[PDB]
Amino acid sequence: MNPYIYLGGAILAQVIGTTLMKFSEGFTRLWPSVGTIICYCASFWLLAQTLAYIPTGIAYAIWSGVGIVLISLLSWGFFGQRLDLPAIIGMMLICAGVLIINLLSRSTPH
Amino acid sequence: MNPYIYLGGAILAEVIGTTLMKFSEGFTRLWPSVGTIICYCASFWLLAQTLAYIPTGIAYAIWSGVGIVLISLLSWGFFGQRLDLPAIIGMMLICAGVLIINLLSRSTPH
Numbered sequence A: 001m002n003p004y005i006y007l008g009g010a011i012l013a014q015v016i017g018t019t020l021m022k023f024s025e026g027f028t029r030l031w032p033s034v035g036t037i038i039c040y041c042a043s044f045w046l047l048a049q050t051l052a053y054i055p056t057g058i059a060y061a062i063w064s065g066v067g068i069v070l071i072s073l074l075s076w077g078f079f080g081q082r083l084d085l086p087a088i089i090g091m092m093l094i095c096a097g098v099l100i101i102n103l104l105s106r107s108t109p110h
Numbered sequence B: 001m002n003p004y005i006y007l008g009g010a011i012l013a014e015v016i017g018t019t020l021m022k023f024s025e026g027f028t029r030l031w032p033s034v035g036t037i038i039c040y041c042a043s044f045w046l047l048a049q050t051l052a053y054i055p056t057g058i059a060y061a062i063w064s065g066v067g068i069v070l071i072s073l074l075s076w077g078f079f080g081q082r083l084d085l086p087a088i089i090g091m092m093l094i095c096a097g098v099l100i101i102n103l104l105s106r107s108t109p110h
């Protein structure tokens, strides 16, 4: 795999998984439930493979924060698309997170 | 039960889980790896108990502020690393980002 394509897959898995679990309200359908756990385990594996390459606690927090803001922003657009302050600030936060991951990566000896 | 104590325990379970996940070094240590799975699942369960008494964004704001300091202290303590300039800005972004998004976000329709 490519580590950024795999990261995009992990972001996609987080978006689908949170939404699917929210709709399900628990484990309802067995194949969705097992598949959701497997997609999260595959996503978690990428963090374990990237353990020393970037500082773990800050990296997880930035990825998680970007993820829930992205999930909320996608849900907000589904409710109705607004050029409003939380959506604008959410995009700025995601852009700052992407920039901060580069800065964390380049302040970590490769 | 006491929900404030449960939330503190839920955060502690994540911080210990993340500490075990770093200690496990790419899944090489078997017994911390087994403990890691249990600690995150326990954190999720304690969080599930919490989110019947403290709302999701309110809980996330507390989790974001309290938890980062605790894992950072352990990160210096056992893994010998210091927060550099972009990591400090990242911590500021995590701390203030939840508050501004939660303040300016608009209510769910359903």
Ligand SMILES: c1ccc([P+](c2ccccc2)(c2ccccc2)c2ccccc2)cc1
Binding pocket: A018, A064, A065, A067, A068, B044, B047, B056, B057, B059, B060, B063
């Ligand atoms: C397990 C179950 C729920 C959460 P989260 C959350 C999900 C994704 C990214 C960031 C946060 C949540 C999301 C939507 C509905 C309910 C719960 C979560 C974590 C800590 C504190 C509050 C909320 C976390 C782990």
